[PDB]
Design a protein around this ligand. Structure first.
Ligand code: ZN
Lengths: 320, 304, 74
């Protein structure tokens, strides 16, 4: 009846005004997320505001999230947008109808992004992109995707889409059904930070500050230590997308993760439109309600990092 | 005439000095990755009013913009970037950053006011790019429009300051590479209103030694164009359109002076386009003028 | 330093307005402004003069109280 259809209203009371109250249960992370959102969507920058809200609309409509799409179209109407643009993708100019190919790959199959897509986007012509103008759009798209995943995962109540998307039946296909991404040849901390800082400094600083808030988040009722099962869930979700760590022994994944949680993670990440209440209740039956939110936050961070690393590797291969 | 010294307080060499549109402010950039702005008081003394770190490498050039758009400055650096600064009510803030280059960016130049708010940059890889700001009320939204590609390494660019409606926009770009071969070092590109693209127009074959700076002349009344080049010597050219693709020009030569017996580094015209100033390796500034018989004499030798 | 209850009696205001009109008649215009400052400092009940204001051509809103040059609204 209140904020979330899954978390009971009494729990929320004891522990876009709905997402903000369901995510507020971990204060040290909310501040960082709001800072990044304010930078990405409100502060002046290389792209116009209306274009930014349209990008948000396009990104949120991949996973079919009504909440975000409604909020962002409401915001877009009041910043000076063209009402004609809301009839479909085919009415927008031929500079936003180029991001529509990288959209699918970043949302569904990150491992297929190559340098030819970047070259197609930056090729000389009558409607081109600059590097800053495009590095902002990439981060915006990833942010909207992860937000949609979390919103569906926690089951948030309120208070068309088929016209904003091309190839509506792409979806996700399992990885094993392509070379493996060794997580020591291209690491965020050593490689991606520097590039994203040179091309877009403030965003890089804010993302690095947001990555370190989802690491120092303790688990109250575990029963080894908190640092172990966190590593397990993080490595599992990275391995789903095609990244394998060299130092980690992958056997402990089963010995540390119940088989019920392993399905909730995959459902909420890969196909977030099919998550339901029974799934939410199957795993961790006798545990506190403020941990099934921490799991969602970890998942969101992991998806963001995987997509960003793939895109940055593509850009670096293009520029070398 | 009279020479007065200024205490710059720069920790390394100074690479550029620029005046403003109303003639009472000045900007200096150095290799200590800094930019300084100077003002002139009623007593006629220059004193600094701002200084701030601008890039992470050596800053080569700094240029002003028209006072219709505000107090705006642009810079280029060894770290392959270009920045736009504005003064708000008094410190200077950063508005944009252009990072498409793969090598060092060498020169930056603002377009004449009647085209809008445009910027042109040149690199050491041979690529010249032209940007634009479609909405003057936000100085943080630039968009790439055109991209030329020369065959050699660029060192300097210059716009045509003519304001006539019978002249199409043009830009001249020069090279500086020393090669054992003999290839043309100066090229001119022109805009085509029908095809909406910049196209090659002429090539200055005679120039073969490395170039260091070029500069068009302020038109104000004429039907042809004047160009100045700073190679090993001082050269002045003339381009006159022929009566009516790229327009056809008749290129001639009107002056050549080896009076520096050194290498010429800089050139600068005056506000009316009648006197040319040149600087060389000896350390002296020389002034050139033309009489009614079209002969170019010397007018003065200024020594530091 | 009278209380706000007595300054709202519609007999003190009549006296103040009559004095201001007398000052206007003699063409003592800077003295009247001097009095107005010292009366607005003490008595905050009365509002100052109402006049015109400039409005934006694209909104219709007021430009009274982020380029200094642009409209604060649009
Ligand atoms: Zn307005």
């Amino acid at each position: 009846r209140g904020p979330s259809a899954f978390i009971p209203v009494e729990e929320v009371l004891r522990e876009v005004d709905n997402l903000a109250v369901v995510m507020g249960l971990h204060p040290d992370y909310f501040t960082s997320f709001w800072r990044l959102h304010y930078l990405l969507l409100h502060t002046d920058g290389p792209l116009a505001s209306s274009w930014r809200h349209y990008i948000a609309i396009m990104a949120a409509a991949r996973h079919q999230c009504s909440y975000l799409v409604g909020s962002h179209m409401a915001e877009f109407l009041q910043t000076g947008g063209d009402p004609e643009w809301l009839l479909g993708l085919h009415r927008a100019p031929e500079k936003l109808r180029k991001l529509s190919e990288i959209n699918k790959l970043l949302a569904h199959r990150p491992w297929l992004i190559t340098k030819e897509h970047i070259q197609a986007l930056l090729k000389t012509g009558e409607h081109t992109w600059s590097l800053a103008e495009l590095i902002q759009a990439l981060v915006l798209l990833t942010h909207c995707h992860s937000l949609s995943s979390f919103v569906f995962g926690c089951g948030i109540l309120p208070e068309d889409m088929l016209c904003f998307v091309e190839d509506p039946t792409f979806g996700y296909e399992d990885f094993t059904r392509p070379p493996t991404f060794r997580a020591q040849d291209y690491t965020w901390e050593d490689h991606g930070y520097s590039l994203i800082q040179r091309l877009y400094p403030e965003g890089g600083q804010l993302l690095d500050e947001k990555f370190q808030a989802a690491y120092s988040l303790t688990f109250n009722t575990i029963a080894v230590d908190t640092s172990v099962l966190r590593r397990a869930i993080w490595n599992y979700i990275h391995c789903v997308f095609g990244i394998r760590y060299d130092d980690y022994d992958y056997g402990e994944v089963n010995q540390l993760l119940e088989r019920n949680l392993k399905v909730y993670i995959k459902t909420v990440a890969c196909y977030p439109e099919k998550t339901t209440r029974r799934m939410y209740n199957l795993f961790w039956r006798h545990f506190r309600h403020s941990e099934k939110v921490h799991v969602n936050l970890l998942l969101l961070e992991a998806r963001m990092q995987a997509a960003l690393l793939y895109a940055l590797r593509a850009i670096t291969r293009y520029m070398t | 005439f009279v020479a007065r010294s200024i205490a710059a307080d720069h920790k390394d060499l100074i690479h550029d000095v620029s005046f403003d549109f109303h003639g009472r402010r000045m900007a200096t950039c150095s290799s200590d990755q800094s930019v300084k702005v100077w003002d002139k008081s009623e007593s006629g003394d220059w004193h600094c009013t701002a200084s701030w770190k601008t890039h992470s490498g050596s800053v080569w050039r700094v240029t002003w913009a028209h006072p219709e758009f505000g107090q705006v400055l642009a810079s280029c650096s060894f770290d392959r970037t270009a920045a736009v600064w504005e003064e708000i009510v008094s410190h200077w803030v950063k508005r944009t950053t252009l990072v498409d280059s793969r090598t060092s960016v060498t020169d930056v130049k603002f377009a004449p006011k009647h085209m809008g708010l445009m910027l042109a940059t040149c690199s050491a890889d041979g690529i010249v790019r032209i940007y634009e700001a479609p909405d003057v009320m936000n100085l943080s939204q630039w968009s790439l429009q055109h991209e030329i590609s020369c065959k050699l390494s660029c060192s300097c660019i210059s716009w045509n300051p003519s304001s006539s409606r019978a002249h199409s926009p043009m830009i001249a770009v020069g090279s500086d590479d020393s090669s054992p071969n003999a290839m043309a070092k100066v090229q001119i590109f022109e805009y085509n209103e029908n095809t909406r693209k910049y196209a090659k127009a002429e090539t200055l074959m005679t120039v073969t030694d490395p170039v260091h700076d070029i500069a068009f002349a302020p038109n104000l009344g004429r039907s042809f164009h004047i160009l100045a080049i700073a190679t090993k010597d001082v050269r002045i050219f003339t381009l006159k359109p022929v009566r009516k693709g790229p327009t056809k020009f008749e290129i001639h030569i009107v002056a050549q002076f080896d009076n520096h017996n050194s290498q010429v580094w800089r050139v600068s015209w005056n506000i009316t386009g009648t006197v040319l100033a040149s600087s060389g390796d000896d350390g002296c500034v020389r002034l050139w003028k033309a009489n009614y018989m079209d002969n170019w004499k010397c007018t003065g030798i200024l020594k530091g | 330093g009278s209380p706000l209850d007595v300054l709202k009696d519609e007999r003190v205001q009549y006296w103040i307005e009559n004095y201001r009109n007398l000052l206007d008649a003699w063409r003592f215009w800077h003295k009247r402004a001097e009095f107005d400052i010292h009366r607005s400092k003490l008595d905050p009940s009365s509002k100052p003069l109402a006049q015109v204001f400039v409005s934006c051509n694209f909104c219709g809103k007021s430009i009274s109280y982020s380029k200094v040059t642009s409209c604060p609204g649009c």
